Structures are given as structure tokens and as C-alpha cells.
Design a protein around this ligand. Structure first.
Ligand SMILES: Cc1cc2nc3c(=O)[nH]c(=O)nc-3n(C[C@H](O)[C@H](O)[C@H](O)COP(=O)(O)OP(=O)(O)OC[C@H]3O[C@@H](n4cnc5c(N)ncnc54)[C@H](O)[C@@H]3O)c2cc1C
Ligand SMILES: Cc1cc2nc3c(=O)[nH]c(=O)nc-3n(C[C@H](O)[C@H](O)[C@H](O)COP(=O)(O)OP(=O)(O)OC[C@H]3O[C@@H](n4cnc5c(N)ncnc54)[C@H](O)[C@@H]3O)c2cc1C
Ligand SMILES: Cc1cc2nc3c(=O)[nH]c(=O)nc-3n(C[C@H](O)[C@H](O)[C@H](O)COP(=O)(O)OP(=O)(O)OC[C@H]3O[C@@H](n4cnc5c(N)ncnc54)[C@H](O)[C@@H]3O)c2cc1C
Ligand SMILES: Cc1ncc(C[n+]2csc(CCOP(=O)(O)OP(=O)(O)O)c2C)c(N)n1
Ligand SMILES: Cc1ncc(C[n+]2csc(CCOP(=O)(O)OP(=O)(O)O)c2C)c(N)n1
Ligand SMILES: Cc1ncc(C[n+]2csc(CCOP(=O)(O)OP(=O)(O)O)c2C)c(N)n1
Ligand SMILES: [K+]
Ligand SMILES: [K+]
Ligand SMILES: [K+]
Ligand SMILES: [Mg+2]
Ligand SMILES: [Mg+2]
Ligand SMILES: [Mg+2]
Lengths: 595, 595, 595
């Protein structure tokens, strides 16, 4: 019987051949990587493999971000395959990115032989960037480490893992017989949680001003958005989402409060500050969401002390519970599965007249107002976003949006109308510039029949623009739109606000994006005035090839609403036409009329 | 002028000679250490030094705990001097102990020469046990590292530091001229804190049911207990303290609520649970104090949501603020100095009739009740503590108490009457058995004219009893009282409670303590019955030599009150005579009449 | 078939019950531990377990050292079971000890619940002290971690491992079905190594002055000493061993060169310095063995450059190959197994006249000479060792010797006649004082029918003398002999040599060992003069109970031969009667006649 527990079907294969086989057993159809010395045995095994698609970037950071985009768009883990030394260190930022945003990234880096330990302590470096890392020391434990890597990466709160593959290990041939449970990937509710759910249902049934605060967690299950709506409809609760949760709830729905937070809807911020019961569904209360944490959720905290409300937190990661604010009730585990047990204990309520009246008043009082175009003025960036949003919806394909980091990121978050889950792929936790373009490529590979749009800033785009050639070589018809304000808008907004318009080294020079696109063998479109906006965007979206659209937008335009650091979530700056006018004069006189 | 900034007075001295000189400049009068190879150059320099007293233990752990006792009794940092390898690793527990209890410990460990790095990564190991560690790489930077070590150890929240001294560095001779600021030890309130104080004073002036929660922090300043009383008298506020804060407030005072927490006064626990304003003075809200954290301070949290009270936290370490419970107002910095700015903004209140009425009712309802002796029964451990407390007070010397860890520790904390600061020296954070005896020696060295009493358990005593000979060789007339219940009472209390009286390996065999004392050249006293209690304790306290008193006390006696894990702070077990009787039968029938 | 790969026989059991079951499956018959809060669920499971013997120390360091002694005496891994906090930190020194000496130690420490992470980063601290540590996060992965712990601890170069067991994990009940390969412990030669062996055999067959340098590695296989002798007899090669390899080769054999190194035989040191081929069998070339590394093995290095000899290194740990000296040929893997492939390729040589002539001349010229007793003088420590060695051999039981650290350790190593493997249990790598007594207890438990003798120093004994009561409670009739020279001889030897007889704090006061033994309920014997030596030792060895023998030995006696630090291995200090006389006068005049 001790022969039925051990498998011998891998005897004779090399490390790389076993790697290839384990990828197949984990249903891996895509690999993003860059060749090198230490990782050659693994590359020589995936050589002309018809079993999965390989995507070659120009830079390993590109590979990492592509795999992130793939992972967020498909729900599968994104596999990266880099070499030793610089190949491995170039994936640190994508790994740190994946960690902050809960992205299932599995990174295999080549390594110098075990007899030598382009050398770097990649395990030591990436320890603060990964859920878990390891070095495979011999070929026999390779399938075991691969299995562990994928599972750790995809369970609990998803995140990056690094598996170090020494050249001699992947080059060696397996001769032993390995345990059969290591050749195969895998493959109840505690009474503490079950009673916590019902105790939480009782608190919701007492609430007269409830609100749902939903995030990325509800997207890690395909039934998530379905049950989120079912709960919102049964108990009649308004729904707000984080930046990472955009698309979890149909924003066209009347109960939608849009995005909350630092640059979220002022109606959403006001609602959560006055709510007596907050239902957190897969969100970790980031400081860019809560604002001043002490002053956050006053009515919810007050209701908790009086046993008539509080904060109901549905988390899968214990480290995220009671970290920022005290959870009145903490329902641990997958939010979607727990919602199946939570909803049927919730009282079906039909009308909340007084509460929804305050909300609709707030929604009317707090739109995403901004200064509209004037005759002869540049295209306002907010208008560009709305234009792209409205035209993209009129296609019978699903639309996936990736962004860079800066003002364009927030405007995209604000003025797009989000309706489908996993359609907002953006670097929110770490906030990595140059994320947009490669993330779009990876998304396009995951979803070939989708329209993938990269709403990017010029500065962000300049960081990784070399990956345009990667998009062509991969056959990914991504649609890149660069909001060219010829500035690092986000930083200059801070300098215009807290540093008396002293723009210190925040204006990089941009290349000719049209000649750049031409050199990358990519379609180029440049919109310069208002009259070309509509016809320009249409040509942009109608393209069947990769296309780079450059739009000249207004400079020195603040993103509003804005909750300043230290201020309460409902203590926000609103857009005012007179104020913006006055800021434009103050900027002109201080800078000498140069900005 | 570049010659006035550099000192040359250390040129010609060895590392050890410089070490000796820097000790003098830091006003170090005592060093606890054990010799070894790597540390010989430092020992050969302190050879027959008349400038400070050296204390030699039998074990390095002994040295560490002695230095802790010295540090807690005197307020000076405790200097340890061990060798490399096992000498260094044996100080890990005292270092971890010092960290949890905020004890200024400066540990110098010898090390193999720089040309070799009994070898151990003592810096790597002790990183999680120290505020800061370092390895001196050359003799010229030795005075600089020594200065840094002492300052880091004694500022902010005090704690242990380790300085690694390679043998070649301490053996080498300084030839360079070192910066004169490194040969000398060293040597405003932010507007954010100043306004936070006044905002905190406004909250206190609104309170009708206030309470002071004082801890070890108020003892790190000689004006602490003075200002603690001044605040308690002006605003008329009851005072409770932690285990580590015992002696900060005169317990004979009517406003004293005694100790709070897991085994604290049930009146103190009830008071804090109903208080609308909690003033935390140098306490970090340990889980053994708060009980169930969610259910902690309900009336204080409720008052905060209504802007009529809350928690006023005076912390010096930012890492301890908003870690456990949300501070309504956080006054950072030294609590004593901040009290000088806080008190004069507090309204002088004379009478709190309704509040103090509830308190005095609670104090009367919740004494430290326990089963008294019966004819022919063993001495109850609570009686032994009271007897020692009452007799020691009748001496014209100050009394310092150290303890081990277990039931005797809590009984000592409960039934002693605490009146003076730095008179309760006990391992509270880490809870190290065998702490008592060596800590007492170190305290006796710091305070030669003091009566130092070690209330120890038999199990705890058995851990480090070899240090008795160290006490004699040091000339420390410590008074050790062993509560011999022939069991690990604390663990057996848990087994009697949560494991159906299944006493699994919790009864170690004790040696003849009288023959043990005789072998250590120490006076031995053994009390066996009630009639010998009074005359026994008197002989114990009247001794002018080191003395070991063994008292046979009742076995299987629970420590009450007790707040069980998970339960609220006011949800405690009280002592009941009928319940204890019934537990004694249930124990006899289950164990078969063996316990 | 997916049901045949998963086991359900652990469903319903608690963590502790599963722990108990896994211990049985790993053939664990002994556990050394100390109770505590966090580890109670594991203790409540081993409660009255008839399946293995529990040994309770007085201190956790005791437990660690006992488990080391058990592990070295039996060849089984030594299992330690401590609690959280101070219980865990007290095992750091035994763990560091086990690492340096290659001792299979498996340490299970209790831990605060997963919902809380007496708290300490025991995993972080012990990372530099263990081959591998881990924290079990849920009960389902507990058997998997236990299996991994034992295997890592016992394969390659054996060493310590720490498994952190959170209280809630060991208290929780398994409900899932775990992979069947995790419920069961487990359960070819590379062409690179195989050809390296034959290349090594060719080098030996060319040698005219070969030598075998054998160490602890040859003891990690029961066929080791057998094949070591077979190789030494076939090719006719003299054999020297390290301190840790004593007993691997019968010292009564003519080919025995005794121990080499800092305090080894001057004949052994001379032989290795002139040998043209050095066969290293399971030794790591410690600096206390090689002396000055550059000047080490001149004739071997010269022979290597001329292709007629060199160093043949049989290592199992790659990290130990080419670390100290360059291996001419490196045969990786278990030395015993590789010897089975190496020996039959070695030419059977019968006589080495010229080589063995030089050796026998060296052996005659370099005995362990020392100053013999004179009328009325104290017993010389060397004589005491020989006396114990000669009398113990006349028993029909096997003799196991443990020691402390210091002069007594080296004298024991020198003057005992070693004949059987695993009979020298001593702290060599880390050199931990207080190792002797608890290591002897653990050895006595492993080998109940053996005479276990602890040759201990007074200072070393004073460190852990409380464990005497542990020996009685365990029923371990250990035989402890304290060489009472009333000094830390080893350190004072260094001070007498390099510091002009300045004995800085190297004389601790000893207790009455006879009254100490009496208090511990242990038989006491005290030898004071030469005439009581023979009859004293006989009573000591004839005892059937635990016995503490105190022998008053000569003070300020150097251990010779001695290779000073920095000097070559054959540049040693020899014993000279005139020199010792002169040193005794120089000591008397400098110290003032006090030493
Ligand atoms: C310039 C800039 C401005 C920004 N401003 C805003 C803003 O105004 N508003 C805003 O919302 N964000 C803003 N952010 C982004 C913000 O920093 C965070 O990235 C984002 O708010 C986090 O969203 P999230 O908590 O929903 O997702 P995550 O950060 O990924 O957290 C999801 C949580 O759900 C848990 N979880 C995961 N899976 C499950 C599961 N299956 N079941 C249950 N729980 C699960 C996870 O453990 C995690 O704690 C900004 C970022 C940048 C760069
Ligand atoms: C078996 C056992 C049972 C126990 N049960 C109890 C119990 O029932 N009740 C109880 O109280 N304890 C109990 N403890 C002890 C408990 O675990 C802690 O050790 C203790 O409660 C902490 O007291 P503390 O916060 O006042 O001191 P500390 O732990 O030393 O914390 C002092 C705080 O004040 C801050 N501080 C330091 N210096 C200054 C300064 N100059 N100015 C301002 N702030 C400063 C520090 O940063 C720190 O945060 C028990 C321990 C054991 C072993
Ligand atoms: C005061 C003092 C003085 C000392 N003086 C001396 C002295 O004079 N002479 C002396 O010899 N020692 C002396 N030492 C001890 C010395 O420091 C080392 O402890 C000892 O020399 C190491 O012996 P070892 O290499 O044989 O064993 P180890 O240190 O345990 O090394 C064994 C080596 O064999 C390898 N190995 C293990 N298992 C196997 C296997 N199955 N197959 C193949 N390889 C394996 C291991 O990886 C390891 O590298 C002294 C110690 C002290 C405290
Ligand atoms: C790698 C990196 N560098 C710097 C930053 C800081 N940063 C955040 S937004 C921003 C400006 C981005 O400018 P742009 O891409 O053009 O976006 P815009 O604000 O103009 O729309 C910068 C520099 C960052 N988030 N990441
Ligand atoms: C080094 C160490 N080991 C174990 C523990 C767990 N522990 C806490 S109290 C206690 C029993 C102490 O018995 P004793 O010293 O006799 O005190 P008693 O309860 O009998 O008064 C133990 C084992 C600890 N705190 N420290
Ligand atoms: C824990 C520890 N502290 C210090 C040392 C340094 N040291 C090595 S040998 C020795 C003296 C031991 O004296 P003793 O036990 O009496 O042995 P002796 O030399 O007298 O035979 C010391 C202090 C050590 N090895 N371990
Ligand atoms: K929107
Ligand atoms: K009291
Ligand atoms: K010998
Ligand atoms: Mg820009
Ligand atoms: Mg006891
Ligand atoms: Mg000695």
C-alpha cells in the first residue's frame, strides 16, 4: 500500500519539464517572463509549448504588472518567470504592488546553483514584499513547493509569492519517487462565526440609517456582486464602494452612492458619516477612504455605544480586523459565503423614507461638478473621461479600464459609469506610476474579446512606454489614452495648494507621442481641440489594432471633491467656479504668468 | 578651531580602559557580570577598580535579572557584562523581560574578533529583544556607541540595549583623535501637544464619574507620584493602578481603588467599567488589565461619542497610543511633565457625592475575601502576606518587594499595603519565573539601607535558587520567603478550572530548603503551623543576614477575584465559601483523594 | 480514488491529541518539558500517557540540555515541550548549543492564540538558533508541520527545530480531512560524487604518510566506527579524532593518535602537520582543531599542489565544504555510506615502516605529561580523571561521560580512555557551562543500564545545580563528580598567561556541596586528600542511587599541551616541571601569596 501513496511518473524529467507539467495541472494558460542564464532550463522546457501562451515584455517590471492585470481581469493567478539578479530585483515593485492590492501573483525567479549560495538575496529582499517566499533546494521537492506557492497566493487575502529556482535544481533530473499528494493541487463554519453572523443580523435589523461599504473583497467571488445586490435590495440599503471595488455594484442603480473617500463622492462621504450602521464587505478601511480616523463614522460609533448600530465587518484576513476601527461585529471568512448565511436572517424592509430622502438630497447637492469648457479653451480632462465612457458603452463588448497614477486616475474613477465587476484595474494600494500600459496588456490577454482602455497620464506613461512594442508582439489590441497636461498634475495640485504654487521639478518634457507610436508600430491619434473630441474618441474606440490616443487637456486643474489630510471625511473641499477663477490669477501672478 | 572639537585624552588607552572611563562618565556605580574569554580585556580593565562595585552571579540569567532589580529600584540603568556565545544567549530572557516591563538595561557582551565574524549571532538573536543593538567595529567608535546605548536605553519608554564588543576591539589601543561630543554623555512642547492638553482638560471638567488609571510610567519621574496625588486631590478623582504601578499612589488614601485587572480589586474593575472619563497615566492597557477589550470601558466609550467624556491617554511611546483602545485625547511625552501643564487647567472640584457613594459601596462589597484558617488547618497564603506586610511596616527602613510568578505574585500584589514608589519589583510583562531572588539581590545593591523581601513560589525559587550564594558573596542581606504549596499553583488553578482537575506534570519535588539554605551559608527559618506564623515572620524580618524563610501554605487555593479570558472586566469570579468547599470535594473525588 | 489519498482518522481529535498521536508515530518515548498556560492543551493530552516518559526539570534550559544528552546518547531526536514567553526564551541557549554540535533537537513551544499575534517573537528570536522554525496556524496542518520538523532535524547535519503551537490551534478540534501523506512520517548516488570517490581513492593510494581525521559525523551512523576501523586497517592509516569524535576509534589500538587540536595530543598535532594525505571523516575543521589556518596541514597542501596527496573531505553539509580549508576532493553525503564505496577502491597496504616509525617516536615523545602529586599536596586533577577512568572500565556496564566547560572538560578528554561511540557527550561548539548535569540526566534516561558520569567544574556545576532534584524525581542514578578547584580554572589559565596573574572576578564562592547534595536527597561523597582518592572513587562508582562526589583538586594548574591562538598546530606549549615551578613563584609574588 506504500506504493499507492507515492508517484513515479515524474522520474526521468528535469526540473523544467516538471515545472511545465505542474503549470498544466494548475490550469496555467499564460506566462509573463524574460529570459536569462539561471532560468534557461525552465525556458528550454516551455520551448514551443503549445499548452500555454508566453508573453515577452521589454522589462521585467513590465512582466510583473502584466501578470497583475491578467490576475485582476481573469481571477486566475498571474505567473511571472524571470531570471536571477537584476531580473529578480526588477519585479520587486510589481510584487509590492500586488501585495497592497491583494493580487494573486506567482513569481518564479531563476537562481545561481545551490553550490554558489548576477547574485542577489532575492528571498531576503522579497520577504517584505510577499505573503511567502521559498527556495527549492532539490528537484524532488519542486512539485511540492509549486503547489504551496499557488495555494498561498490564492487563498485568504490573495497576494504575491516568490519561488526561487536554482539553475542546478531545474537542470537536474528527478530519480526519487515523490509523495503523490505533492503532484496534485488541492484537491464548515465555526460556531463562533455562525453566532457572530446572527448577532450581526440583529444589529442591522435595528438600523434606520444603514449603508453598505463594499470593496475589492466582494470581487474575489463570482457570486459576490450578485449577493451584494440581493442584500441591498432586501434590506433596502444604499451602496458605496472603494476605488478597488468599482463595478461591484451597478452605479446606475438608485441606491448607488458612487465612490467614497479622499476624492470620492461628497454624497457618499456625508452618508457614511451620518450612517448608524456600516456594513463593510471586503474593504480594509484604507486611510485614503476614512480620512481622519478618529472623526470617522461618528453616528456609527455612537450607535454602537447605544447598542442600536455599529460597524459590521466581513473580513477574510484577521490581520485586517480591528486594525483601523473597532468592529462592532467581525464576521471572518469569505464575504460572499458569509453573505449566504447573513442575508436570510435580515428583515426584508421595503421603504426608508426619511433616510433615502436625506441621501437623494445629498446626491443632488454633491455631483462631480467641474469647470466646463469655454470657447477656445482646452478640453477639460473630466469631459474627456465622460466622452470615452459614453461611447464605449455603445459597443457590444465588455470594457476593461486600467489607469496610471495621478489626477487622470481619480477623474477616471469619478466620471466613468461602472456596471460590471473586474473592470477597474488600477494601482490603489502602492500607487505605481507606469502601471497602466502593461496592466492593460495583461488584461487584454486574459480577456481577448474585451475592449481594454488605458486612461494614462503623460508622466505615468513615460515610465513604461517601451512596453508598447510588447503589446504589438503579443497581439494585444489595447487602447491607450494619454491625458497630456504636460505636467505631473497630482503633485502640482499639492504644490498649488500647500506650497504657494512653487512647482519644484514637476514638469517633465514629453516626447512626440505620435512619432513614438509610429516607431512602436502602433496607431496614433491626437486630439488638440474641442471639435475633434467626439470624432477622435470614436476613431480611438473603433480601432481593431493597438492604438495610442493623445489628448491635449487643460493644465493646473484640481481634482475635486478633496478631503485634505487630517480633516474629517465630511469636511471636504467642493468645486466652486469663483474659487477656481481666483486660483488661476494667484497662480499667474506668483509664477509670473508661466503656469 | 578644528582642534577644539576633537579630544585626544583617550589616545593610548585600550578598549577596556576606555570602557572603564565611559562607565565613570555615565555615573555607573554597579556592574553585574560573568567572566569569559572574549570579554577578558574589559575585565582586565575593571580589575580592582575602586570606582564601582562588581557583582558576580552563578549564571548570566542571574546577572540580567539582578541588573533589572537594580534598575527598577534605583532608576539608574542596570549594566550587564557577559562574554560571548553561551554567556550572551543566557541574557536573552532578562533582556526580553526588560523590554516588556520598560527596564533600562545596558548589556555589553564580549565577542570573537572582527577577523572571525563560542560564536553566535548575538546581534541577530537579540534584535527582537532590544530597543537597539550594535557591534562596535573599532576602538575609536567605542565611546560613541556607549553614549548611544545609554541614551536609547533611558529615553522614551526605557528598555534593554545590547552592545557587542569584539575581543580585538577592546584589546586594541586608540591612536586616532575622536570627536569631543562622543566622549561626553548628553549633556520645548509642541503646539500640537499643548492644545491637546487643554482640549483634554475641558473633557475632564465635564466628567461626573472620573477615574485615574495609573501605571509604571508615572514612576519614571520622581515628581510623578507627587503630581498624581495633586491631580487626584484637586479634581477629586479615585485612583487605580496596575501591577507595575503599585506604590505610585498611597493605598491608605480613601481615593485609592487598589489594583485593577484580571486579579485586581473587583471594586476597581467595576469603577473603571462605569467611569465616564478615564485618565491613563503611564499605562499601556495590557490585556491582563482590560479583560475583553471590546467590552472594556463601556461608559467611557459612550461618553466619548456624546462629547462628555472618554479616555485621556498620557503616553511617551507613540507605538502604544491607539494600539489597544482609541484614545479620545492623546497627550504625548513624559506624563509627569505634561501633568505640570494639565493640572492648572483642571477645575478644582470639592465633592462628588453620587459618584464616591457608588465607589465606597463597591469598596465595601468587594474586598479581597478568602477562606480563613480553621483549627488545625495549614496557614492560608493570603494570611502570610498580610502578616509580612503588617510587620514590615513597623520598621524604620523602607521596604522593597520582589516576587516570582504565580499565585504568590498576585496574593502579594493584593494583600500588601503599597505606599511608596518603586517598591513593587516584579516580572509582569514577560512573567519570568526565577525572577524574584536575583531581582531582590540587585535591588538590595541599589538600596543597601532597605529591607528587600522576595515573596517567591517554590517552583519559581527552584529555577534560580543557586543565586543564594551570589547574595552572600555580594553582601546583600535579602529576605527570601518561599510560599511552599508543593505545587505550581497558578497552572493548577487553570487545570482545576478548565481541565477537570487533571494536574498534568504540575507538581515538582522540592528540596529541603533548610538544608539548602545551610549549604548556601544562609539563615534558615521554617514555619509549619499557624502558631509559628507571627514569631516566625518576626525572626525573618529581624535578621541582619541573608535569610531563607519557608512557609508551609494551603494547597489548591484559587486566586480571587478572577476575570476569566474572554469575559468582561466587571464579569468576574468572586470568592464564595460554599463554592470553595464544593470545589474541595470535587477535587478529592476526581483525583481519588490525592490532591 | 480521491478518498484513498485523504485520511479522516484524526477528525474529532484536538491539537494536543493529534500531537500525542504524531509523537507515537515518530517513535518518541521521552519528552522533556515544563508546564505553562499556552501549552496546557498539549499537556492535558499527554496526561497520564503510558505511551512515553515525561521528564520534568526545574528550569527550561535544563529541559533543553537534557534533551541534547538524550539525543546524543541514543541517536534519537530529543523532544522539548515548553510554554510561551519565558519558557520559550529559556531554551535559546540549548538550541544554540544543539546547532553548533549538530544535535537533533525538536522544540515545541506553546504560544498565545492566533488572535493575539507572556508574548514573544520566539520564531524571530530562534531563527538564528535553528535549522528551521515554524508556527502552526491551524490544527489541520499540525501533523504536516510535525513531520517536517522531525525530518529537517534529523537529516543532513542534524540540528534544532522550533515548532510554535498557538493555544487555540492545540485546543481546536480537527474537522477537515487531511492528506494521508501528512499523517505518516517518511516513509541513489550522483555520478558527480561516485567519480569523486574514485578520484579520491587514487589520491590515497599514492600517499606514503596518510592520516585519518575523524569527527562527530562518523557517529551519526551505526556502521561508522566499524567502517572507520576497516579503512584504517586495510590501508594501514593512523587515526586522530576531535573532541566530539572521541569513542569513534578504539584508543587502545596502536594506530590511535588520540585527540588533536588546541589541547589535543602533541603527537596528533605533529602527525597531521606532516601528513601528505588527510582523510576528513565527518569533521568541520573547527578553529580549535586547526590552530592557525594558514599554517595548517603544510605537507598536505604541498602534496596537493604536486598531485601526490591533499585533503579528502567527507561532508554531508555543503556549507561546511571549502569553508575553512580547500578540499582536494569533496565527497558529499553520509560519510559511512560513502565509505562503503570508497574502501573497496583503496589498495590494501600492510606496512608503512618509515611513517609509523616517526609516529611511534612522536607518541613516545608527546604523552599527556603533568606534575604528579607530592607528599602532602592536593590531588592533581589529571590523576582524578585517570582514577575514574580505570575504575569505571572494571564494570560490566557501558560508561557514558558528560562534562561541563573548562579545564576539567579538557582533562577528561585527555586522560579518559575512549573505546565506544557516543560515550563523550560534551558542549564543544558553543561551550555551555552548566551543560554537564542536565545532559547526564538525559543520557541516563536514554541509556538506563549505563553508568553516566558527569565530570563537572565547580563554576559550571553552580550554574545548573538545581537540576539535582530533577535527577531524583526522574529516577536517574547519575554520577556527578565536581572538580572543586575553587576557581574558574580555564579563565584563570588565560589570566595567568596573558594578563600577568590579574585574576579579575574569576573566583566564585562555592556552597557546601555535601549539604547541597543532602538537601537534594542525593548521596554525597567528599574526597579531600590523596589517601581517600581510590576508596572514594570506588564508593562513587559503586553507588546505585544518584551521587554527588566532591574532590578537592590542585588550583592554578594549566591544561597542557596548549596551542595558543594564532600559533601553528605544531607550535605548542609542552609541560615542563621547571617551568611550572617557576610559574608558581611568579604567581605567589605578584598576587602577594594569595593564589
Ligand atoms: C492617488 C490615490 C488616491 C486614492 N484615493 C482613494 C479614494 O478617494 N477612495 C477610495 O476608495 N480609494 C482611494 N485610493 C485607493 C486606496 O488607497 C486603496 O487602494 C483602496 O481604497 C482600497 O480598496 P479596498 O479596501 O476595497 O481593497 P483592498 O485594499 O484590496 O482590501 C480588500 C479587503 O477585503 C479583504 N478581502 C479580500 N478578499 C476577501 C474575501 N474573499 N472575503 C472577505 N474579505 C476579503 C482583504 O483582506 C482586504 O482587507 C487612492 C489611491 C491613490 C493612489
Ligand atoms: C500571572 C500574571 C497576572 C497578571 N495580572 C495583572 C492584573 O490583574 N492587573 C494588572 O494591572 N497587571 C497584571 N499583570 C501584569 C500585566 O501583564 C502588565 O505587566 C502590567 O499590567 C502593565 O503595567 P503598566 O502598563 O502600568 O506598565 P508598563 O507595561 O511598563 O507600561 C507603561 C506604559 O507607560 C509608558 N511610559 C513609560 N514611561 C513613561 C513616561 N515617562 N511618561 C509617559 N508614559 C510613559 C510606557 O510606554 C508604557 O506604554 C499580570 C502579570 C502576570 C505575570
Ligand atoms: C574550551 C574548549 C576547548 C576545545 N578544544 C578542542 C581541541 O583541542 N580539539 C578538538 O578536537 N576540539 C576542541 N573543542 C571543541 C571544538 O570547538 C568543536 O566542538 C569540535 O572540535 C568539533 O568536532 P567535530 O567537527 O568532529 O564535530 P562537529 O562540530 O559536530 O562537526 C561534524 C561535521 O561532520 C558533518 N557531518 C555530520 N553528520 C554527517 C554524516 N552523517 N556524514 C558526513 N558528515 C557529517 C557535519 O556537517 C559537520 O560539519 C574545544 C571546545 C571547548 C569549549
Ligand atoms: C513611481 C512613482 N513615482 C512617483 C509617484 C508620485 N506621484 C503620484 S501621482 C504623480 C504625478 C503623475 O503625473 P501624471 O502621470 O501625468 O498624472 P496626472 O496627475 O498628470 O494626471 C506622481 C509623481 C508615484 N505615485 N509613483
Ligand atoms: C519560565 C517560566 N515557565 C513557566 C511559566 C508558566 N507559569 C506561570 S505561573 C507558574 C507556576 C509557578 O509556581 P510557583 O512558583 O510555585 O507559584 P505558585 O503559583 O505556586 O504560587 C508557571 C509554571 C512561567 N511564567 N515562566
Ligand atoms: C555560560 C558560560 N559563561 C562563561 C563561559 C566562559 N568560561 C569558559 S570555561 C570557564 C570557567 C569554568 O570554571 P569551571 O566550571 O570550574 O571549570 P574549571 O576550569 O575550573 O575546570 C568560563 C567562565 C562559558 N564557556 N559559558
Ligand atoms: K461614477
Ligand atoms: K493592597
Ligand atoms: K585518551
Ligand atoms: Mg500629467
Ligand atoms: Mg507553588
Ligand atoms: Mg573550577
Amino acid at each position: 500500500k506504500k506504493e499507492q501513496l507515492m508517484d513515479d511518473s515524474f522520474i526521468g524529467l528535469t526540473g523544467g519539464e516538471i515545472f511545465h507539467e505542474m503549470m498544466l495541472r494548475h490550469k496555467v494558460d499564460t506566462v509573463f517572463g524574460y529570459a536569462g542564464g539561471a532560468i534557461l532550463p525552465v525556458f528550454d522546457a516551455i520551448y514551443n509549448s503549445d499548452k500555454f501562451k508566453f508573453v515577452l515584455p521589454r522589462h521585467e517590471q513590465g512582466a510583473g504588472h502584466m501578470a497583475e492585470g491578467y490576475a485582476r481581469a481573469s481571477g486566475k493567478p498571474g505567473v511571472v518567470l524571470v531570471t536571477s539578479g537584476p531580473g529578480a530585483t526588477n519585479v520587486i515593485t510589481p510584487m509590492a504592488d500586488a501585495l497592497m492590492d491583494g493580487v494573486p501573483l506567482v513569481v518564479f525567479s531563476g537562481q545561481v546553483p545551490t553550490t554558489a549560495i548576477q547574485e542577489a538575496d532575492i528571498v531576503g529582499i522579497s520577504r517584505s514584499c510577499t505573503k511567502w517566499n521559498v527556495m527549492v533546494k532539490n528537484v524532488a521537492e519542486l512539485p511540492r513547493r509549486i503547489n504551496e506557492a499557488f495555494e498561498i497566493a490564492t487563498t485568504g487575502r490573495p497576494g504575491p509569492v516568490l519561488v526561487d529556482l536554482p539553475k542546478d535544481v531545474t537542470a537536474s533530473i528527478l530519480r526519487e519517487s515523490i509523495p503523490i499528494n505533492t503532484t496534485l493541487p488541492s484537491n464548515a463554519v465555526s460556531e463562533f462565526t455562525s453566532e457572530a453572523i446572527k448577532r450581526a443580523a440583529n444589529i442591522l435589523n435595528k438600523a434606520k440609517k444603514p449603508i453598505i461599504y463594499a470593496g475589492a473583497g466582494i470581487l474575489n467571488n463570482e457570486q459576490g456582486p450578485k449577493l451584494l445586490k440581493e442584500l441591498a435590495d432586501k434590506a433596502n440599503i444604499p451602496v458605496t464602494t472603494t476605488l478597488q471595488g468599482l463595478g461591484a455594484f451597478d452605479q446606475r442603480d438608485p441606491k448607488s452612492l458612487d465612490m467614497l473617500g479622499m476624492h470620492g463622492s461628497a454624497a457618499a462621504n456625508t452618508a457614511i458619516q451620518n450612517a448608524d450602521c456600516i456594513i463593510a464587505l471586503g474593504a480594509r478601511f484604507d486611510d485614503r477612504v476614512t480620512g481622519n480616523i478618529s472623526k470617522f463614522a461618528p453616528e456609527a460609533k455612537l450607535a454602537a455605544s447605544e447598542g442600536r448600530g455599529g460597524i459590521l465587518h466581513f473580513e477574510i484576513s484577521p490581520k485586517n480586523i480591528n486594525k483601523v476601527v473597532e468592529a462592532t461585529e467581525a464576521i471572518e471568512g469569505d464575504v460572499t459565503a458569509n453573505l449566504q448565511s447573513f442575508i436570510p436572517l435580515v428583515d426584508s424592509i421595503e421603504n426608508r423614507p426619511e433616510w433615502f430622502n436625506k441621501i437623494n438630497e445629498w446626491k443632488k447637492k454633491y455631483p462631480y461638478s467641474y469647470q466646463l469648457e469655454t470657447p477656445g479653451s482646452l478640453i477639460k480632462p473630466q469631459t474627456l473621461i465622460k466622452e470615452i465612457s459614453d461611447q464605449a458603452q455603445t459597443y457590444n463588448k465588455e470594457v476593461i479600464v486600467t489607469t496610471g497614477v495621478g489626477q487622470h486616475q481619480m477623474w477616471a474613477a469619478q466620471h466613468f459609469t461602472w456596471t460590471q465587476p473586474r473592470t477597474m484595474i488600477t494601482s490603489g494600494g502602492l500607487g505605481t506610476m507606469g502601471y497602466g500600459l502593461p496592466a492593460a496588456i495583461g488584461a487584454q490577454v486574459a480577456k481577448p474579446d474585451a475592449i481594454v482602455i488605458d486612461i494614462d497620464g503623460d508622466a505615468s506613461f513615460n515610465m513604461t512606454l517601451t512596453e508598447l512594442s510588447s503589446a504589438v508582439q503579443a497581439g494585444a489590441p489595447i487602447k491607450v489614452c494619454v491625458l497630456n497636461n504636460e505636467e505631473q498634475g497630482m503633485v502640482t495640485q499639492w504644490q498649488s495648494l500647500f506650497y504657494e504654487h512653487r512647482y519644484s521639478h514637476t514638469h517633465q518634457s514629453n516626447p512626440d507621442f505620435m512619432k513614438l507610436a509610429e516607431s512602436m508600430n502602433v496607431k496614433g491619434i491626437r486630439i488638440t481641440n474641442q471639435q475633434e473630441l467626439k470624432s477622435g474618441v470614436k476613431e480611438f474606440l473603433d480601432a481593431t489594432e493597438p492604438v495610442l490616443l493623445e489628448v491635449i487637456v487643460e493644465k493646473k486643474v484640481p481634482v475635486l471633491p478633496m478631503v485634505p489630510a487630517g480633516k474629517a471625511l465630511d469636511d471636504f473641499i467642493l468645486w466652486d467656479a469663483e474659487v477656481e477663477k481666483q486660483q488661476n490669477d494667484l497662480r499667474k501672478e506668483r509664477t509670473g504668468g508661466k503656469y
